[PDB]
């Protein structure tokens, strides 16, 4: 299923994504969501994200509901509002979305405790892609990462299911990427999704 770079669909090059606004580029029915990020107490800006429903519908919908507050447990919404980025590796990726525990151990999806890997269509071919964190095959939950470089060694083990849109989005990713971290790559100052939703 994995596409080579020469066979990638229109709308997902870095240049194309950086020209993006608030509407999807890969397929017209893909949802666009956002995170407003705080670094410590300071507003860092907005990351807009196209979710590739056309290629990874389950993964896209899971992320979308966690952005909008539509997923509940016994009538209590849970999702990315207030979630942190707990693992940041310069020149590699930024990882977050553990709203369960805030430390990387958390796993919950809108489908249950976990959900299987969808088809591995897209490669980790550049910075600015959204991909699922996991604990091996068929263990997707709530965590994700945004690539800060090509990382094709992750291909066929993590589903690439979205892309950040526009220059501000990437600027925010770069800001997060370069914060000071401890020896375990945890930020010294918290990085939080203070608001999120659908555009």
């Amino acid at each position: 299923s994995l596409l080579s770079e020469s066979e990638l669909p229109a709308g997902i090059s870095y240049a194309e994504a950086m020209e993006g606004g608030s509407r999807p580029l890969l397929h017209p029915d893909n949802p666009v969501v956002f995170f407003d990020i705080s670094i410590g107490s300071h507003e860092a800006g907005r990351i807009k994200i196209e979710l590739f429903k056309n290629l990874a519908p389950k993964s896209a919908e899971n992320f979308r509901q966690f952005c909008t507050g539509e997923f509940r447990q016994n009538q209590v919404p849970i999702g990315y509002k207030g979630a942190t980025f707990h693992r940041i590796i310069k020149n590699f990726m930024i990882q977050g979305g553990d709203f369960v525990k805030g430390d990387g151990t958390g796993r919950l999806s809108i489908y249950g405790s976990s959900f299987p890997d969808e088809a591995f269509v897209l490669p980790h071919f550049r910075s600015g892609l959204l991909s699922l964190a996991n604990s091996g095959p068929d263990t997707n939950g709530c965590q994700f990462f945004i690539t800060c470089a090509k990382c094709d060694w992750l291909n066929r083990k993590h589903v690439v299911f979205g892309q950040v849109l526009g220059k501000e989005s990437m600027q925010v990713v770069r800001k997060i990427e370069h914060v000071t971290v401890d020896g375990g790559n945890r930020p010294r100052i918290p990085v939080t999704v203070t608001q999120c939703g659908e555009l």
Binding site: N134, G136, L154
Partner: peptide, 11 residues
């Protein structure tokens, strides 16, 4: 190494 796992980060 350079992985993205959820619980025990490996090399």
């Amino acid at each position: 190494x350079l992985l993205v796992t959820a619980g025990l980060v490996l090399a």
